[PDB]
């Protein structure tokens, strides 16, 4: 339901790409989503599901 750092910057890029931002940052966020979620895995989603989640 709720996820800190993972959502924190996850939305940062979501809004950026929405309002037109650089792919470098948009993807970067996708990464923090995969990286942070893996660190998260508290006891809710396990590798929390943000949105972008991993990007090539």
Sole residue written with tokens 């910057």: 9
Give the Cα separation of 3 and 40 in Å (integer): 8
Check if the beta carbon of residue 48 is closer than 8 Å to that of residue 32. Answer: no
Q: Which domain holds residue 47?
A: 1-56
Give the Cα separation of 37 and 54 in Å (integer): 10
Tokens of 8: 């924190």
CB atoms within 10 A of CB 33: 28
Three-state SS annotation for 8-44? HHHHHHHHHHHCCCCHHHHHHHHHHHHHHHHHHCCCC
Look at the chain and report how many structural domains it folds into: 1
**In this structure, what CATH number is given to the domain that contains residue 40?**
1.10.287.10
Sign for the pseudo-dihedral over CA of 12, 15, 18, 21: negative
| Collapsed DSSP state (helix, strand, coil) of residue 54 | coil
Check if the beta carbon of residue 37 is closer than 8 Å to that of residue 3. Answer: yes
User: Determination technique for this PDB entry?
Assistant: NMR
- Expressed in angstroms, the distance from the first to the final Cα of the chain is 26
Tokens of 52: 């972008």
């Amino acid at each position: 339901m709720v996820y800190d750092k993972i959502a924190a910057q996850g939305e940062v890029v979501r809004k950026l790409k929405a309002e037109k931002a650089p792919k470098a940052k948009v993807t970067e966020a996708v990464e923090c989503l995969l990286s942070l979620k893996a660190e998260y895995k508290e006891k809710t989603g396990k590798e929390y599901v943000p949105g972008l989640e991993h990007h090539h």
